[model samples]
Target: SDRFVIWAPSMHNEPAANMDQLFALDSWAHRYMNKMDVVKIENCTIGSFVEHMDVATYDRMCNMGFRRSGKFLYKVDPLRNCCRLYTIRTAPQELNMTKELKKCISRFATRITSEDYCPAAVASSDFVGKIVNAEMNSKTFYTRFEPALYSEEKYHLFVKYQEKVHQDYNNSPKSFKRFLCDTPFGPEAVLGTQESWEQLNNWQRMKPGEKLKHMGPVHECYYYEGKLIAITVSDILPSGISSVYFIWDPDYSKWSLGKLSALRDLAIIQRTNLQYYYLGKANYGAEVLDVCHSKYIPLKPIQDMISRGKLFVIGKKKTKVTKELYLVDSETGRGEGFPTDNVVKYKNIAEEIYGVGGCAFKSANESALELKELYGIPYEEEDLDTIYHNGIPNVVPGLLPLWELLDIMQSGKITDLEGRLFLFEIETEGIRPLINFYSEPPNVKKRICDVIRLFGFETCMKAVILYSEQM
Candidate 1:
């Protein structure tokens, strides 16, 4: 609905020489800290405040290390928050269920009749015992997201479960709403009679977004002998289903209803395009809770995974790990080395190149000669020599061309991509005598292709080069 920045300093520290975020309340503050882990981390979070966000936005935020709680969103205070609070996600393809876990799932399946049946809306002519579904939103069947003015056995159940099971005694309707229902997804839940199983699935469902593939929240209503007992609240994204939250009667706590719900969700997810699951602190406990116990969930941290279509270190980056690492564009075979140190070093050089002819062609070389008629190259090899010899190269003597070229590659106007055709528009429109670096008709695109064809490959056994010093 709206956006706000939460700049929270989670830990209690006195004055500092520099303070950036001042207004943020620590969403993870009510926890124990025996000591501290000192480190520098980089993180920035853009909050999209609402219940359910667009699938694209939600997935983006989740990947960028954000967790949603109630109406608020939280991420690593990267500037101050250390690497301790790393994000964890699980690929459903990688879910290795143990013997015990399988037994749990098996038990739930046997106990409950898991169907996609919209039981509540259907008028109930019950099994000769109790009446349900058609019952009005009376004292009982009015679960979390019932479409009514007021009355809540659902809210009461949530609070009671939260207090009894969690040992968190503070259970008011407002706190319950703040934790779960504050978001548009209040949850679908159940118990006794047809109203139990039926009312749990009765939550309002539909959307106002330009909906795409599987872009909404879902509820897995678990019923036992026609009694509603558990609910798993999940959101569907293009990537996968997120395990948002789950609550069941504490009486059924031994069934491990939450975990069983996950296994059930995975069954449906595997059948669809989504094959991964996002379990985070917001729905569980806090970052500390998930971070500490993530191994149990078998969650692979984002830092440890090869991000799709992203440049990732094949081994590791900026650290002296046992393995040697290089930045690999897995899709593109062409790879580059990640920084041996922090990326701040590369930023400094990129900024420097921005100063030095990042967009300017300082020398009329092969790439620039055709353009020389209109755009002149003022400096020569001396300028480049100064950069390579006396400049930042002394510190990082290697990766010389990489940084130099990166600056040129990154520092250009949007129009630079459109090429001389746009400049041609100016000339044809009599708005000529153009602005910046100009080119003659070089067909550089073809030349690049030609060079690639000429130079790229691992060729033959007979490939012998001219002897080292034979020149």
Candidate 2:
């Protein structure tokens, strides 16, 4: 379920639990780590990380582009995440479709599994009864974004896991791999390749369509004594590791080891700092996986942690909402491109967002909290207390930050009704509901901010309008 909750004091909203299963994920990192001197990871040394001040502004980190890089926890929303422009609506909105637009997003959303997969990445194991011991793999390890190395034992477990589910959705071995994993282009080659071969550089020469192979997928294996007990299938993605599938033996189910499965996968990601967790989406671009269930279900932007947020899936002529299309990046919070990537309509809005006000860490983190109350966007309170505690350098001296703009508008002291409109101007910029867009702290141009901050908004708009007409 795409849902979130306000953790409080922080502006970023966490992915709410699934609406049905009482959505559980309550058992993550010691709740989560803003920095080091933390509990959770055993034997962790002090200053190994930094803790965000309870009131630290998540928005500031966002401004500085605090993406899910190595060692940083990018607690991804439960689905493939994308920010802004995905606006939930008060009523059903319509967007046209085109085949050309389809070509790119389709491939981007799906995962590639295999292409003459190398068996060397997988190793053999030893066992007896239900309490076997050793787990082994090939001498050379191949880590690709594909299915875990295949084995008769895993296949048997796969069938068992599926049998436990509804047969109506039964999947074949190959189909399961396809659904659960994809082969990333180049992360592996040159790793163990011969004599500075630079196979990765050579891979760049390969045709884009060339189905080059990588390595074995990431796996979490367990043993009940000398016997194989369970196995988990996960994928290493550009964003982070996506837990794909898990299977275990019912014969020894009493161990209550299910908890360990995710725990193991968690350890792997935390080590690499791929913070985003991809809880596979019900549909890639569809409003609803089963229209037979909820026909009018509109997509939502889960990142903001806003319940009312809607996802605007444009470029489709489908009779059903299943015809959703991709627009922006799930990786770059600074936001990727639009479905159009290049367009004043697209580029300008992105600049407004990623510019200064939108990202937090870029500012002093304090500004982020201020923006939070000012705009009410979802905010996370992650602070880098280790910094010199020095004041941040100013952005384009005297340009009105979102907080400053809010102050001026609040001070306008217009009638409650008029003063309210002043608020929506900036508010709507983050929501952009009128154009089915998501809003962010726009990077108001220095000249423009100076005009609006000094001459007032209407004057700034008048100049822009006149300039546009002249152009």
The whole-model lDDT of each prediction reads: 0.35, 0.29
Please give the range of 10 consecutive residues that has the lowest summed lDDT in model 2: 126-135
Q: Write the per-residue lDDT of candidate 2 for residues 132-185, one digit (tens) a residue.
A: 011121222112222244566666666776676433246677755443332221
Tell me the tens digit of each residue's lDDT in model 1 across 1-471. 211111111222223221222211121121112211321223333222333334444554454344665544444332122222345455544555465665664443333333432234321211110112212222323223222111275565666677788877767877655655554322331112344323334322212232223354544554454556766666666666666678788887778866666655554454453545666511221111121111222212322212221111122224332211111212111111133444333211221222223322132132333222323322123333222111111111111122222233346421243322112222244422223332423233222111111111111011111111111
For each candidate in turn, give its C-alpha RMSD to the true structure in angstroms. Answer: 18.6, 23.3
**Best model number under TM-score:** 1
TM-score of each: 0.42, 0.28
Indicate the TM-score of model 2. 0.28
After superposing candidate 1 on the true structure, give the runs of residues whose Cα lies further than 4 Å from its correct spot.
1-53, 78-86, 113-151, 184-214, 281-471
